[PDB]
Ligand binder design. Structure first.
Ligand SMILES: O[C@@H]1[C@@H](O)[C@H](O)OC[C@H]1O
Length: 792
């Protein structure tokens, strides 16, 4: 019915803006920005093979061209590149080709001589050294040379360059952070994390290097001096089982509370080519509305224009539960401020952003989010460490922000960290026993069993009749036979011929009988950083998740994914398999590149920005992996043992925000276990928490060929009855859904009364309600958006 232009040049520009807001300047003595007309020598072999993404499902976007850093600098017309040094690298690389693997964390560095380095210095004004790292799916990052540490030849390179150049810039082309101890010690003039910026990364990076854009990126994780300083390191890296003993004390929640001196760069840290002054302003609280309102003014007090981020933190009273010193509750990035100009920033913060989950009952409100009695102090500033008192208010009694239930609780006891108040008025870590679950799972499922809809194969309503409002969804679903029900819970793929070639899955109209009811085939495709088309078809490769999050700018993120929204329609992809939004529990997790933060509020807010983007033209995202997939090693069977409180405040919280702020209507579960069973068959996760408590209205799908089990039972890839009993609606994926290619147990379990028809009907109703609002339904109804690409 309607045509829309996808302007490719504006798509490039939107993505380019994200890159130039997401680079994080850590150190600078004034060597950056690069001066007009300067000649730069670029060191590091990885300069020729810019890491545009990490590896795995989320790093297989095909493109015709990648603008690396050298090319980005030449295109700027602000500097020139030393062409002799480039040719040394190019010629060396013909003998030492880029290893593709399985793909390694890094490439072997070219050894440098005194002659090469000395001659480059004579013919250039500044050295740029690029250190490259990638990482991803199934391969965790490791505390060794070539991975988290510099390799020996990389260190040599840096020391030579330092010696022969008095102007030296180090750039980290990395998916996740690496060791900064040796780099800091070598002490370059400027240090910037440039992440992996997709196919136009070099353009946006050139913008900040040349000063066309002033750096305004901030860290989404705390950088500590050693891997052993991180509170999760003790309990990370075990393929069988890991106890989340740090509990709520993840990242800056640990460091700012217990170990300030172990931090090199705090959460939210990043600098600019200008300087800013944050002046605390008016503060009011509204206890009856459960909000406070806080103002401050940010002023550019330096000599060049730039943006800054105002970050707001709450210190809750320790009470009986114990608390982190500071938790992030709001942030706002300024517009571009000219020298001597300023911007007033006001935030309204609901109490639920700094509530605590009582999993012991010590507050008198077990299984509730609560604010304990005491003094709440609010802080504003440039990062968590440099945040200063904005206001305060005191509660004489507990406030229950929300009543919940005992759900997804641990099945075995373990000791967790506890904030303990010393005689000094300081806080130390002590340990306490996590209570074990007393939930009767059998009874919970039976007491909440949905009502069966009597089947009726004569009255043949269409899914169009449900969409129009002509009939109830219940009235429609009655025509599905047991074959139809068994079939509709199966995703078909990879590369099902019902949808665009080379994508992840088709679902909904996966049989002739389902298609006859006007259930369309809905197409899923990886990934957060752009469409992965295994046909070889090209698509936009966008910056990695961590770079997105480092913008601290929901609007710039949403703008870019508004273009992705149209591109998906163009390719007839309805469901992009992102955002990835598992918490950065440990820096060594391989997939941190396509996730956002150690902080759940930032995590959810960035995820929600992406989803709003995709929703612009009616496309959609699938939040993943729900939940606690914070480790790649052992991910087919690993058991994350974690408290309710840690789940409610940290790991689930981002996903909750995705539902309630982001309008998320599609979730993906994990390959692994949380509290002693696989996530795909967990009732508490997929029904109790997600639907009954949060009000999610949508679909849940498995991760691709994930295992499912009943608690205590053996894991398999075809226990779909366990999956449907949990209200995980879709098994992803089978070669042929109509033929039950996986030989699943849906019908045999239904035959034996161990699976109720009502449970199948519930899943089928979720699938159909989702499917009828997709662009694939619009194509059947002939009221879809037609997209045309301009600017190529
Ligand atoms: O993240 C998912 C990954 O775990 C799986 O292997 O492929 C599908 C992706 O969406």
């Amino acid at each position: 019915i309607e045509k829309v232009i996808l302007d490719w040049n504006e798509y490039i520009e939107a993505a380019r803006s994200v890159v130039s807001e997401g680079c994080v300047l850590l150190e600078n003595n004034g060597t950056l920005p690069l001066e007009k007309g300067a000649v730069v020598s670029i060191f590091g072999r990885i300069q020729t093979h810019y890491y545009k993404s990490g590896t795995g499902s989320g790093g297989m976007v095909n493109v015709t061209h990648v603008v690396g850093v050298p090319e980005g600098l030449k295109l700027s017309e602000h500097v020139t590149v030393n062409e002799e040094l480039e040719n040394i690298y190019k010629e060396w690389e013909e003998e030492n080709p880029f290893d593709e693997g399985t793909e390694p964390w890094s490439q072997p560095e070219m050894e440098l001589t005194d002659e090469i380095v000395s001659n480059a210095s004579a013919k250039s004004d500044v050295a740029i050294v690029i250190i490259g790292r990638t990482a991803g799916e199934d391969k965790d990052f490791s505390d060794v040379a070539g991975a988290y540490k510099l390799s020996e030849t990389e260190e040599d390179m840096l020391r030579r360059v330092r010696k022969h150049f008095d102007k030296m810039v180090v750039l980290l082309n990395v998916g996740s952070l690496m060791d900064l101890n040796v780099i800091s010690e070598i002490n370059p003039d400027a240090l910037m994390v440039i992440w992996q910026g997709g196919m136009i990364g070099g353009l946006g990076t050139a913008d900040v290097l040349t000063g066309k854009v002033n750096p305004s990126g901030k860290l989404t994780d705390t950088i500590a001096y050693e891997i052993n300083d991180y509170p999760s390191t003790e309990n990370f890296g075990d393929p069988v089982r890991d106890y989340y003993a740090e509990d709520i004390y993840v990242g800056y929640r640990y460091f700012e509370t217990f170990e300030k001196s172990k931090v090199r760069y705090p959460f939210g840290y990043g600098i600019s080519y200008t300087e800013f002054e944050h002046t605390v302003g008016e503060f009011t609280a509204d206890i009856n509305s459960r909000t406070f309102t806080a103002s401050c003014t940010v002023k550019n007090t330096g000599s060049v224009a730039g943006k800054d981020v105002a970050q707001f933190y709450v210190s809750a009273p320790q009470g009986k539960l114990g608390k982190p010193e500071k938790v992030l509750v709001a942030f706002k990035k300024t517009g571009i401020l000219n020298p001597g100009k300023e911007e007033k920033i006001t935030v309204t913060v609901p109490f639920d952003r700094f509530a605590s989950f009582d999993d012991t009952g010590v507050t008198g409100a077990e299984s509730c989010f609560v604010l304990e009695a005491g003094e709440y102090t609010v802080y504003e500033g440039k990062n968590v460490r440099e945040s200063y008192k904005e206001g305060s208010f005191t509660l004489e009694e507990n406030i229950v922000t929300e009543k919940l239930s005992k759900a997804l609780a641990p099945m075995e006891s373990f000791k967790r960290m506890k904030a303990s108040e010393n005689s000094d008025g300081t806080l130390s870590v002590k340990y306490e026993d996590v209570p074990v679950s007393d939930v009767d799972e059998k009874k919970r499922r039976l007491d909440n069993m949905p009502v069966e809809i009597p089947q009726d194969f004569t009255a043949r309503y269409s899914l169009k009749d449900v969409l129009s409002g002509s009939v109830d969804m219940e009235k429609f679903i009655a025509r599905l036979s047991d074959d139809d029900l068994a079939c509709i819970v199966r995703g078909e793929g990879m590369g099902s011929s019902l949808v665009t070639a080379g994508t992840a899955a088709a679902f909904g109209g996966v049989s002739e009988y389902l298609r006859k009811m006007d259930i369309p085939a809905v197409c899923c495709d990886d990934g957060p950083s752009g469409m992965r088309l295994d046909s070889g078809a090209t698509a936009f490769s966008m910056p990695n998740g961590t770079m997105l999050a480092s913008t601290f700018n929901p609007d710039v993120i949403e703008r870019m994914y508004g273009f992705t929204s149209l591109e998906m329609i163009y390719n007839k992809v309805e469901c992009l398999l992102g955002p990835g939004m598992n918490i950065h529990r440990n820096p060594l997790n391989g997939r941190n590149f396509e996730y956002f933060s150690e902080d759940p509020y930032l995590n959810g807010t960035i995820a929600s920005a992406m989803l709003k983007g995709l929703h612009k033209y009616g496309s959609d995202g699938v939040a993943k992996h729900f939940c606690c997939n914070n480790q790649e090693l052992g991910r087919q069977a690993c058991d994350s043992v974690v408290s309710q409180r840690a789940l409610r405040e940290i790991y689930l919280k981002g996903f909750e925000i995705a539902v309630k702020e982001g309008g998320c209507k599609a979730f993906m579960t994990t390959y692994a276990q949380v509290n002693g069973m696989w996530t795909a068959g967990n009732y508490d996760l997929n029904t109790r928490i997600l639907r009954d408590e949060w009000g999610f209205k949508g679909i849940v799908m498995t991760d691709w060929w994930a295992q499912v089990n009943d608690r205590g039972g053996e894991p398999t890839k075809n226990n779909t009855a366990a999956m449907v009993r949990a209200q995980n609606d879709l098994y992803m994926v089978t070669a042929n859904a109509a033929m039950n290619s996986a030989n699943d147990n849906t019908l045999s379990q239904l035959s034996e009364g161990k699976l109720n028809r009502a449970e199948l009907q519930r899943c089928a109703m979720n699938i159909c309600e989702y499917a009828m609002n997709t662009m694939a339904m619009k194509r059947l109804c002939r009221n879809d958006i037609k997209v045309e690409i301009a600017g190529r």
